[PDB]
Amino acid sequence: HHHHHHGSMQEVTMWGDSHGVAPNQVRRTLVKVALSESLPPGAKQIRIGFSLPKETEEKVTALYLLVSDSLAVRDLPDYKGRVSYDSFPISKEDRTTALSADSVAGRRFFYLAADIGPVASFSRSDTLTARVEEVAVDGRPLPLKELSPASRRLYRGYEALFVPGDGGSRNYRIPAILKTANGTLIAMADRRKYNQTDLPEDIDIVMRRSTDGGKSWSDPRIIVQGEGRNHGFGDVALVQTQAGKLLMIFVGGVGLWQSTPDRPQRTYISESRDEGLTWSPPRDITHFIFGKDCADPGRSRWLASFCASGQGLVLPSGRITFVAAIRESGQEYVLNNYVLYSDDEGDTWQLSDCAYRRGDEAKLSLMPDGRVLMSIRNQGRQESRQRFFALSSDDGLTWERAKQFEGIHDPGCNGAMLQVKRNGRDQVLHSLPLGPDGRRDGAVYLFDHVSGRWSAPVVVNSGSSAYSDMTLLADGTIGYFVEEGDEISLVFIRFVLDDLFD
Ligand SMILES: CC(=O)N[C@H]1[C@H]([C@H](O)[C@H](O)CO)O[C@@](O)(C(=O)O)C[C@@H]1O
């Protein structure tokens, strides 16, 4: 029938790759090919024919056939040897290649990979592609099931900073990026050691640093170690204060909806005075926000609070701010937003007036005229499934809803904003998944302050895409730090605005 009964039906499945790439990167997958079964014992060779346009050929320095017993999602070097593979060189002018079945040694997964040269142009049109045209065993072709085209966009930088398996952690989630005044880059993450689930699972906070603008990164270091279920840590947000100290804020303990006034999920801060090399022991500041030890009786029966992961905002006055999403009642799964802020470099903390009813993870950015813009995640598919916005003209103390900023879809995800100037026009860059209604196709949009209108989205990384954080580098490049894949890797991408929009 569909399944015949005259022998073993070998089936070949073939995926083109669409992850970003950057110049001078080695062994980047263009196409992956999987056999459903091992080559049979009587088989002597497998031959793979492929096409590759001249514009791609002009941008690579070498080609390879990689053979592995594992089927990997990312480029094989991204797994740092945790995926063992053999590498068989191909001349860049060649369009076929063959391997003995002994060389293949029972393995089923084949990768057409390339070394990328020192490319000069990064426009939207500059993408690498290849196609596998033939797979034959003992000179007999097999039917190829093609499941996606190859299209790898060239970016000025592109690096997976945290990949499932790294350091023994099974998974990673929740990206936070910070550029300090001296130019250092701090990237932090949930080290989701056993699986991808949120607190109250056992989770660590891990960090990597770069002192050359993201060209190279230090070995990952665990900053805060989880100590078991209900005793992990995660959801980091970062700022640098006016005095120059770095500050991280994070939660730990039970899950968000399990937190109670008397047994809370706690909020901690830790600071660094040396550009992220060393960090102070985490200090519990839960008592400034809610619960049993809170000095405000009106908030002592609040149940939960957490600041949105990524970055806060330090205002021109030196006021340090993070938006907290707070659970006020145990009868409902509903959060309200309040700005958590300090006017004494983190010694004490206060709460603004309520900024958003039925909000979720929220971010802040500084308007050109000095007002503060809040972007609030739409949780629970409220209203028109749009992202929510609010404005404050008193440095974050009081707020009004700002529907004139609404206009982009939010499938219910954390994202980030940057205030940017383009062609003399003040604008806000906003990162979110495009969806629709799913965490797919990581996108950026530009909102024009003066016309009150949003651009069409530009997809930065197609495929599964979730939380993102953004920072401006000293030289005008943008650093974009996104959750890629269903099993997430945290990826740091660098571009200028013209690379995406004009
Ligand atoms: C402290 C905490 O629970 N943070 C988590 C939040 C909240 O659950 C929602 O924002 C509440 O609505 O969202 C995630 O689950 C998500 O949506 O990927 C991941 C993140 O770790």
In whole angstroms, how far apart are CA 470 and each of 86, 122, 175, 439? 37, 19, 10, 18
Q: Identify whether residues 161 and 71 lie together within a single domain.
A: no
Q: Identify whether residues 67 and 194 lie together within a single domain.
A: no
Q: Identify whether residues 111 and 215 lie together within a single domain.
A: no
Residue 450 to residue 430: CA distance in whole angstroms: 16
Q: Identify whether residues 128 and 205 lie together within a single domain.
A: no
Phi then psi for 55, rounded to 5 degrees? -65, -35
- CA angle in degrees (0–180, nearest 5) for 285-287-289: 85
Q: Identify whether residues 148 and 263 lie together within a single domain.
A: no
Binding site membership of 235 for ligand 1 (Cβ less than 6 Å):
yes
Cα–Cα nearest to 218, from 236, 201, 230, 206: 206
The answer to whether the Cα torsion of 326, 204, 472, 469 is positive or negative is negative
Cα–Cα nearest to 468, from 478, 458, 479, 482: 482
The single-letter DSSP state of residue 219 is: P
What proportions of the chain, in percent to the nearest 5, are helix, strand and coil?
5, 45, 50
Q: How far is the CA of 235 from the centre of ligand 1 (A)?
A: 8
Which distant-in-sequence residues (6+ apart) come within 8 Å of 387 by Cβ? 375, 376, 377, 378, 406, 408, 409, 410, 415, 430, 432
SS3 at position 411? coil
Indicate the number of domains in the chain: 2
Q: What is the 3-state secondary structure (H, E, C) of 34-83?
A: EECCCCCCCCCEEEEEEECCHHHHCCEEEEEEEEECCCCCCCHHHHCCCC
In whole angstroms, how far apart are CA 50 and each of 28, 58, 111, 135? 16, 16, 11, 9
464 among the known binding-site residues?
Answer: yes
> Amino acid identity of 100?
S
Q: How far is the CA of 198 from the centre of ligand 1 (A)?
A: 7
Q: Identify whether residues 112 and 208 lie together within a single domain.
A: no
Indicate whether 484 belongs to any domain.
no
CB 311 within 8 A of CB 302: no
- Which ligand 1 atom sits nearest the alpha carbon of residue 235? 21
CB 354 within 8 A of CB 376: no
Q: Could you tell me the two tokens for 20?
A: 């970003």
Structure's resolution in angstroms: 1.9
Cα–Cα nearest to 270, from 212, 231, 225, 315: 225
Burial 352-369 (b: 16+ CB within 10 A, else e): beebbebbbbbbbbbeee
Cα–Cα nearest to 477, from 425, 392, 418, 401: 418
Cα–Cα nearest to 13, from 96, 71, 86, 81: 71
SS3 at position 497? helix
Cα–Cα nearest to 367, from 423, 422, 315: 315
Q: Which of 124, 153, 182 is the last residue of a domain?
A: 153
The answer to whether the Cα torsion of 160, 164, 169, 175 is positive or negative is positive
Phi then psi for 257, rounded to 5 degrees? -80, -5
In whole angstroms, how far apart are CA 437 and each of 148, 413, 467, 482? 22, 10, 14, 18
Q: Could you tell me the two tokens for 124?
A: 């939207």
440 among the known binding-site residues?
Answer: yes
> Amino acid identity of 222?
I
377 among the known binding-site residues?
Answer: no
> Amino acid identity of 435?
G
Binding site membership of 361 for ligand 1 (Cβ less than 6 Å):
yes
Residue 408 to residue 446: CA distance in whole angstroms: 10
Q: Which of 126, 153, 180 is the last residue of a domain?
A: 153
Q: Identify whether residues 57 and 193 lie together within a single domain.
A: no
Experimental technique behind these coordinates: X-ray
Indicate whether 38 belongs to any domain.
yes
Indicate whether 418 belongs to any domain.
no
Indicate whether 452 belongs to any domain.
no
Indicate whether 118 belongs to any domain.
yes
Phi-psi region of 141 (alpha: psi -120 to 50; beta: other; left: phi over 0): beta
Cα–Cα nearest to 13, from 35, 45, 31: 35
Q: How far is the CA of 259 from the centre of ligand 1 (A)?
A: 14
DSSP-derived pairing of the beta strands 144-148 and 185-192: unpaired
Q: Provide the 10 A C-beta neighbour count for residue 397.
A: 16
Q: Identify whether residues 366 and 234 lie together within a single domain.
A: yes
Q: Using alpha carbons only, how large is the chain's radius of gyration in Å?
A: 25
Provide the CB-side half-sphere exposure for 101 (13 A, CA).
Answer: 15
Give residues after which the chain gaps, C-N over 2.5 angstroms: none
Indicate whether 246 belongs to any domain.
yes
Q: How far is the CA of 197 from the centre of ligand 1 (A)?
A: 10
Longest dimension (CA), the chain: 80
**CATH number of the domain residue 218 falls in:** 2.120.10.10
Q: Identify whether residues 94 and 128 lie together within a single domain.
A: yes
Binding site membership of 256 for ligand 1 (Cβ less than 6 Å):
yes
Phi then psi for 405, rounded to 5 degrees? -90, -10
Indicate whether 1 belongs to any domain.
no
DSSP-derived pairing of the beta strands 310-311 and 233-240: parallel
Q: Identify whether residues 140 and 165 lie together within a single domain.
A: no
Q: Identify whether residues 163 and 295 lie together within a single domain.
A: yes
SS3 at position 168? helix
Residue 351 to residue 307: CA distance in whole angstroms: 12
Q: Identify whether residues 22 and 170 lie together within a single domain.
A: no
- Which ligand 1 atom sits nearest the alpha carbon of residue 265? 1
Indicate whether 447 belongs to any domain.
no
Which distant-in-sequence residues (6+ apart) come within 8 Å of 146 by Cβ? 14, 15, 16
CB 409 within 8 A of CB 382: no
Q: What is the 3-state secondary structure (H, E, C) of 386-397?
A: ECEEEEECCCCC
Give, using CA atoms, the residue closest to atom 15 of ligand 1. 198
> Amino acid identity of 392?
S
The answer to whether the Cα torsion of 383, 387, 393, 395 is positive or negative is positive
Q: Which of 132, 153, 174 is the last residue of a domain?
A: 153
| 258 CB-contact burial (10 Å; exposed 0-12 / middle 13-18 / buried 19+) | middle
| DSSP E strand boundaries for 241-282 | 246-252, 266-272
Could you tell me the residue range of the domain that residue 63 belongs to? 12-153
